[PDB]
Amino acid sequence: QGLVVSTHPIYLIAKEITKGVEEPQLLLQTPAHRKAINDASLVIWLGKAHEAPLNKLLSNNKKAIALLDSGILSILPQRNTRGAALPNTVDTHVWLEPNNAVRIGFFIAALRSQQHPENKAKYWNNANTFARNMLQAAQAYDSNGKPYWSYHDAYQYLERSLNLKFAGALTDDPHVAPTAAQIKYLNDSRPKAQMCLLAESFTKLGSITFQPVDESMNNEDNFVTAWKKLAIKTDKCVLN
Ligand code: NA
C-alpha cells in the first residue's frame, strides 16, 4: 500500500517527491515497524551499512531498496580520525551532498512511478521542483578551503558544496570518548588559531567555535530548508 522510509532525512526527500499523491511513513522515529513493512508496497532504506539491526528484514525483502547498494549515489569511503580513507568502506552520510539528495529524489520518482503509473507525471514534476530547490540552495556556495574539526565524522558529504577542508575528528565512534592523544594531535596540527568544531548536539582543544549541526534533521519538516540551515550554520562556524 504505502511507501515506508527508514530515516528522517530520506523521509523528508520522499515527502517532497510524493507531495499531493500520498504520505510516506517514517519507520524509525518493534512489531509495529514489522507491520508497516509487511503492508508497504515500497521501502526505502540506506542499507546494511547504516541500519545493521534492520538489516535482517529489509535485506531479504524484495520491495526494500537500499540506496547505498543501488549505484545511484556518489559514495565516499569512511575516514579515520585523521582524514585517511579506509579501504572498502562507505561513508553512509550521503544526503548532505546536494547532488545526492537530487539523485535520491529522481530515484524515488522512478520507483513509485513504476508501481503507480497513474501518478507518474506528479512524482516526476515533484522530483524536478525538489531538484530546482536543492540546486538553488547549493549555488549560494561557490573560494579558499575552510578548515573544520567534527566531534565524529558525519559531514564529509557537505565538504564539496561549502568548500570545507576536513582537519580531523575527535573520535571514530560517538560512544567512545576522544583520546588525550587525538585531542593533542588535533591541537598541535591546528590549521588555524580559532578552529570551528561541529557536533550533533550542544551536550584542551584550545580556541574553538562550537556549532551543533544535526545531519539527521530531526526537528525539521522540509529537507532543503533543513539543508540551507545546516549549511549556513556550518559556513558561519568556519568563517568566524
Ligand atoms: Na557529487
Expressed in angstroms and rounded, the spacing between residue 230 Cα and the centre of ligand 1 is 18
Expressed in angstroms and rounded, the spacing between residue 183 Cα and the centre of ligand 1 is 31
Expressed in angstroms and rounded, the spacing between residue 17 Cα and the centre of ligand 1 is 20
Question: Could you tell me the sign of the dihedral formed by the alpha carbons of 126, 111, 35, 68, in that order?
Answer: negative
Owner of C-alpha cell 565524522: 153
Expressed in angstroms and rounded, the spacing between residue 147 Cα and the centre of ligand 1 is 20
Expressed in angstroms and rounded, the spacing between residue 150 Cα and the centre of ligand 1 is 21
Expressed in angstroms and rounded, the spacing between residue 67 Cα and the centre of ligand 1 is 15
What is the spatial distance between Cα 148 and Cα 205, in angstroms, rounded to a whole number? 13
If you write DSSP's letter for every residue of 187-240 in order, what string do you get? HHT-SSSSEEEEESS-----SEEEEE--TT-TT-S-HHHHHHHHHHHHHHHHH-
Under DSSP, is residue 85 helix (H, G, I), strand (E, B) or coil? Answer: strand
What is the spatial distance between Cα 113 and Cα 145, in angstroms, rounded to a whole number? 41
Expressed in angstroms and rounded, the spacing between residue 179 Cα and the centre of ligand 1 is 33
- The whole-angstrom distance between residue 15's C-alpha and the CA centroid of its chain comes to 16
Under DSSP, is residue 146 helix (H, G, I), strand (E, B) or coil? Answer: strand
Q: Which residues pair with 25 in a beta bridge?
A: 4
Under DSSP, is residue 169 helix (H, G, I), strand (E, B) or coil? Answer: strand
C-alpha grid cell, residue 230: 545546516
Expressed in angstroms and rounded, the spacing between residue 145 Cα and the centre of ligand 1 is 17
Expressed in angstroms and rounded, the spacing between residue 161 Cα and the centre of ligand 1 is 9
DSSP state for residue 79 in the 8-state scheme: B
Expressed in angstroms and rounded, the spacing between residue 240 Cα and the centre of ligand 1 is 27
Helix (H) or strand (E) holding 60: none
Expressed in angstroms and rounded, the spacing between residue 152 Cα and the centre of ligand 1 is 22
What is the spatial distance between Cα 80 and Cα 142, in angstroms, rounded to a whole number? 28
What is the spatial distance between Cα 101 and Cα 156, in angstroms, rounded to a whole number? 14
Torsion angle defined by CA atoms of residues 226, 238, 210 and 201, in that order, rounded to the nearest 10 degrees = 20
Give phi and psi for 122, each to the nearest 5.
-80, -35
DSSP state for residue 25 in the 8-state scheme: E
Task: Single out the residue of 51, 80, 65 nearest to residue 14, CA to CA.
Answer: 65
Expressed in angstroms and rounded, the spacing between residue 155 Cα and the centre of ligand 1 is 14
Instruction: Answer left, alpha or beta for residue 198, where phi above 0 means left and psi between -120 and 50 means alpha.
Output: beta
